[PDB]
Amino acid sequence: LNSINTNPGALLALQNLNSTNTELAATQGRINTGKKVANAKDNGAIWSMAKMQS
Amino acid sequence: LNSINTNPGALLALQNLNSTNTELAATQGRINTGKKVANAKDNGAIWSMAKMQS
Amino acid sequence: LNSINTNPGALLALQNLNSTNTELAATQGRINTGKKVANAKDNGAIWSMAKMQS
Amino acid sequence: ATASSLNSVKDSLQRGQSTIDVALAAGDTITDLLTKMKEKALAASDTSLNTASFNALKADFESLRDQLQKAATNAKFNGVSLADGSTTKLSFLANEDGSNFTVTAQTLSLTGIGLTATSTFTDAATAKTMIATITTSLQTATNKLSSLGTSSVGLDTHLTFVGK
Amino acid sequence: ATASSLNSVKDSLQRGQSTIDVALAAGDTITDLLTKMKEKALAASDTSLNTASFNALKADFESLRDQLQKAATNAKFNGVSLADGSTTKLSFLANEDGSNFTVTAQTLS
Amino acid sequence: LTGIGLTATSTFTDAATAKTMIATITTSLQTATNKLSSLGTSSVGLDTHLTFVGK
Amino acid sequence: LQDSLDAGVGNLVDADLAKESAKLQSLQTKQQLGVQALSIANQTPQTILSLF
Amino acid sequence: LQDSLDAGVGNLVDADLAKESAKLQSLQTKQQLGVQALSIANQTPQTILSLF
Amino acid sequence: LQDSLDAGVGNLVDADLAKESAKLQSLQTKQQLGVQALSIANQTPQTILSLF
């Protein structure tokens, strides 16, 4: 706990900030694209389904 | 992730904005022309049939 | 290392700061001109091509 | 002593890039001058023009070439120049032992781009011949400025390496 | 006498580090000139260019080549270098008995 | 200056003469520095001999 | 043909500012980070003063 | 493709600065602790004067 | 033209203050270390009184 070499709590806070940044990037993609399934990485089954539909 | 030299998310958002701008340019072009096949680039076969019938 | 006369590390940081400063200068030039090839110093061959075409 | 001697190499390199900047600033005007003379020769190529418009375009060409020669002769910094043709080249320090960083002069004066001080056009055919020589002068001028700019980028790179 | 002799090995390793830093400073420019030369030759390969554009690309290519040879010649540290090709290797002190820490030269000419 | 390779009137009068003078000034600084190194070694030997004379 | 020539000159010289604004902000961050790093490098030598 | 190659270079060389901030503060503390430990090791021998 | 001459005089004359700040701080640290060394040199004679 009382260490100058390392601190777990800063690592956990950075992990949580990275998760928030990833959620913000996904929100940016959904906003600028207008689609919740914009590509095959989003969800492949419904993506190929809508591809054949189009 | 927490890079200061390059940010991929801005690149992806700019690609989406360029796609939207291209679709808007095609829309304004076929609005001002009044034709969905205004030239050979739009569809060369339909343009050929239409020019021969004309 | 433990020198009262000269320290290499501040010189290295000064070179890195000068590098980011000249990159910011190129950024300001591309912004205030609007061209990536505003003059012969940027790229002489493409500049001559653009001058002949203009 | 070898380290302290490099400040002269650096300030000479900076004076050299400043002279390059002055020559490029003059060439930026010389190119537009050549372009407008090309447009005037193309306009004077017409056989349908009345004589009055022909003398008018000829007067524009005279004033244009005179302004080109003046802007070419005004391009100098600290008493030296790489555009007026007064010298074939200028050298600047590149190392503490006295090695030089040569920068060839690229004349931008009227005679250096294939134009004479008297060159004009008298009839439509002379303007039609003038079109191609003005295009060649614009081409050689842009090539000279491209060489000057590449020399400037090399000067900057050598300055950075000398600082390292 | 051994502990006193080690100072020369320390100074020799520091001198070799400074020489390698000079060689790296020259290579940082040689790599950029090679990248721009690849750019110029690659654009020059296009057949749609008119002759004047090809001449300008050729002039830029030759100018960058001469600048690359210049940057290769300027790499040296107090009369010795690992990049200009003047020598095959430098033998740096590694212990008090005279054993050497060889560093092979890498010509950048 | 006579021991340093310089004359009392030594002087460049032209850019090429100054470029030739650069190597002369370098050789002069080098020989002067070697002379000072010899003086320092002689002074260290003098101090060593003084300590031995005291012993 | 004149419109095509102008479009080609614009394709040759014009910069993509939408790319450029992100580069501007990132360099503005890197500048402050470099100033802070140079300040810490300047602060480093003085710690030896405590030993005397 | 050019965007993908630039993103790959950024993944390959860029530092994760958010960890570097905590590393910087921890090293700034360790440096002062090291100077104090060196000063104590310096003062330790001098106690021999008391026995004479 | 006048702009180019002003920029050239600025290149010939102006100093790089970012290096001057480091020069200044290292010179202050050297001045304090030298004042302490002068104090030690002044205290060197003091042992002579112990002889009598």
UniProtKB/Swiss-Prot annotation, chains A, B, C:
Superkingdom, natural source: Bacteria
Subcellular localization: Secreted; Bacterial flagellum
Subunit structure: In C.crescentus, the flagellar filament is composed of multiple flagellins of 29 kDa; 27 kDa and 25 kDa.
Protein family according to the UniProt entry: Belongs to the bacterial flagellin family.
Main function: Flagellin is the subunit protein which polymerizes to form the filaments of bacterial flagella.
Name this polypeptide is given: Flagellin FljL
Gene that encodes the chain: fljL
Residues represented out of the complete protein: 2 to 55 of 273
From Swiss-Prot, chain F:
Subcellular location: Secreted; Bacterial flagellum
Function: Flagellin is the subunit protein which polymerizes to form the filaments of bacterial flagella.
Quaternary structure and partners: In C.crescentus, the flagellar filament is composed of multiple flagellins of 29 kDa; 27 kDa and 25 kDa.
Family membership: Belongs to the bacterial flagellin family.
Name of the protein in question: Flagellin FljL
Species of origin: Caulobacter vibrioides (strain ATCC 19089 / CIP 103742 / CB 15) (Caulobacter crescentus)
Shown chain mapped onto the complete sequence: 165 to 219 of 273
